[PDB]
Ligand SMILES: COc1ccc(-c2cc3n[nH]c(C4CC4)c3n(-c3ccc(OC(F)F)cc3)c2=O)cc1
């Protein structure tokens with residue numbers, strides 16, 4: 219009684235959707251390195267032997283798309299036809315046009331930076347939970363770390379049969395605690411990872427338990443009842459884009475909170491700061507994390523929304539799950555006094571012209587590496 | 600006190616992401632019309648002058664992709680270069696391969712239908728709320744209806760300056776009611792819609808208020824304080840794929856609950872029943888709606904999760920927001936006694952080999968047209 223299960227998933231750097239997010243952000247970073255004010259909306263599609271870039275970019279940068287794309291794929295680890303994909307020999311197709319002048323005139327042309335309009339309408343959420351130091355759900359943190367461990371053991375040659383495409387899934391049993399949640403145990407773990415033709419299934423399952431799970435998940439969460447689904451399909455030689463077409467912005471729940479909190483639907487990768495799908499979601503995370511680290515709540519959800527061409531948010535809402543002594547009205551007043559959620563101010567607070575976006579495009583955008591949206595603001599009230 | 604704001608958005612049939620969802624589902628339906636057991640994973644990408652199909656299909660059907668794609672675009676209304684896109688003259692490119700034999704062997708080959716494995720791992724949620732008869736949030740229902748009204752007035756020639764690409768957004772002020780929610784008033788409406796070169800902004804704004812909003816939103820929700828952002832960008836002549844690249848599965852929150860409830864990240868369109876991203880989300884909606892229509896709760900969230908190759912869900916969770924006299928344990932027991940959430944049983948209960956998918960791909964998958972997942976199951980307990 220008073221317990222429940224929750225499941226989250228994550229994917230590796232070579233999962234085809236994640237390849238697309240990383241390439242889209244490599245293109246964004248390449249532009250920002252030369253033109254901090256580049257307007258970028260770069261979608262990527264990946265299928266057998268193909269990376270296609272489709273979208274809209276208006277920028278003063280001179281970017282070599284062939285080189286940027288191939289370097290991103292090389293970093294991921296797809297460097298030979300035996301692995302199903304090779305940066306040296308794949309097709310890179312480009313269908314990029316300028317930003318629509320109708321959007322440009324309605325959003326940013328002849329506007330003071332602080333007063334630029336939102337680049338689109340939409341809704342966005344921020345979330346934070348005190349269950350981990352990084353203020354993230356344990357389910358998603360563990361799922362990301364399992365993928366990172368696979369990449370580590372692939373890159374260091376420990377498990378040379380590993381290939382870049384992987385997925386993980388973690389189910390945790392939680393105890394309810396006055397609106398907050400306390401992890402009790404890991405109920406189920408799934409790991410699927412692309413592999414070479416020579417390794418056998420038993421060798422893989424043993425290595426995934428001993429060298430991956432045990433190296434990531436604290437033993438205190440694992441018990442005799444924990445269920446393991448390791449290589450459950452039985453064979454995963456074909457992988458990457460060859461096994462499944464990838465697209466940018468198809469892992470938006472992996473990118474955020476693993477299903478916890480809420481999501482407004484917008485993808486992050488391949489977009490400059492004027493696209494509030496990314497900047498306002500980062501600012502909302504920053505607000506939520508600041509409320510938790512500031513001791514005002516233990517668990518909190520923030521919604522914001524925008525209209526294209528309008529700078530100020532249309533709506534702001536805060537839900538504290540019963541974990542604050544302050545009302546929603548009081549928390550909203552604190553947020554109003556401490557944050558300015560116009561995109562032209564978020565860009566300054568979070569330094570969103572800096573070319574750090576490729577680093578966000580795998581293992582989640584939140585709870586890692588002290589990015590600006592992860593450094594809480596000291597609140598005055 | 601005790602009130603809060605919530606915002607949801609919707610998009611029209613000609614929004615580029617939605618074009619892709621509709622084409623992906625037109626391809627799925629074309630296959631299912633000839634082969635009820637087709638394995639389909641069809642992604643679509645749209646940019647100026649281009650529809651690209653990328654993915655994996657194993658099927659006995661003989662499908663004319665050129666015809667299926669062009670007919671879907673014609674239905675949407677993109678039939679002339681003056682509108683930015685034309686089904687008669689666009690490029691249709693196909694990058695479709697068979698389903699990976701490694702996936703096929705791990706999921707469905709030599710398996711009894713009821714015992715087919717999930718086509719992938721993942722998590723999915725279902726949600727229902729008694730605030731409307733259709734058990735959907737008012738924010739998303741109104742946002743969808745505003746887009747449908749635009750399409751209606753475009754097609755009937757009432758507002759011949761309208762083009763197919765549109766977005767809407769509705770913010771409602773709600774009253775808290777013992778875990779359930781009661782709509783009070785519409786706080787803000789956004790409408791952006793592509794238009795011809797001849798109509799002026801004032802004519803559009805007047806028509807959007809008088810012929811669109813007033814024809815959809817009950818007057819009791821609108822007052823002197825309601826904020827209207829109508830054509831807020833000021834100009835939207837360039838639109839459809841020309842204005843913004845579209846991809847399948849980039850409107851997953853529009854497709855579901857408009858941000859309410861929760862989402863596991865999986866896209867619906869272009870996928871056959873074995874892909875639990877779609878079938879298990881439909882079954883979870885069916886469960887949630889059955890719990891609300893059965894009088895067991897007023898508002899409910901259901902999470903399920905799967906592992907590739909495994910038939911039974913790995914986890915099931917139910918959260919009733921404090922709106923049931925039964926505990927989560929009791930509701931879980933009722934669900935266990937009444938539903939079988941293996942994909943090979945969901946297919947039978949929800950008739951998921953039927954080619955009705957293109958109809959789901961605009962205006963939301965839930966709360967409309969008495970699809971099987973919208974017809975509550977009579978619960979025995
Ligand atoms: C009295 O203290 C409490 C009381 C309750 C709960 C809690 C219980 C619970 N049972 N099933 C779920 C969800 C998986 C279905 C629960 N959720 C919950 C609700 C929403 C979430 O985010 C997003 F999915 F919307 C995540 C978890 C709780 O919050 C927690 C603390």
Ligand SMILES: COc1ccc(-c2cc3n[nH]c(C4CC4)c3n(-c3ccc(OC(F)F)cc3)c2=O)cc1
Pocket residue numbers: 479480481519520521535536537546603604605774775776777778779780858859860861
């Ligand atoms: C005592 O009865 C109640 C008590 C509280 C609330 C309620 C208040 C509330 N203030 N802000 C929000 C969210 C926009 C931030 C609220 N939410 C809420 C929470 C989660 C939702 O779904 C998804 F976003 F996760 C949707 C709405 C409530 O549920 C409702 C009824």
Ligand SMILES: C[S@@+](CC[C@H](N)C(=O)[O-])C[C@H]1O[C@@H](n2cnc3c(N)ncnc32)[C@H](O)[C@@H]1O
Pocket residue numbers: 233234235383384385410411451452453454455456457458461462463639640655656698699701702705718719907
């Ligand atoms: C299972 S595939 C999605 C379904 C696929 N489009 C189809 O044609 O059935 C989704 C993801 O699962 C992983 N995957 C691919 N092949 C797999 C296999 N043989 N076993 C397990 N997971 C696999 C990859 O990460 C891939 O991007």
Ligand SMILES: C[S@@+](CC[C@H](N)C(=O)[O-])C[C@H]1O[C@@H](n2cnc3c(N)ncnc32)[C@H](O)[C@@H]1O
Pocket residue numbers: 258259274275317318320321324337338526614615616764765766791792832833834835836837838839842843844
């Ligand atoms: C604003 S665009 C996204 C940003 C875009 N990729 C860019 O290059 O800035 C997203 C959606 O908004 C709508 N849209 C396109 N042009 C618009 C305009 N001029 N005014 C308002 N909405 C527009 C279309 O529905 C489009 O799919």
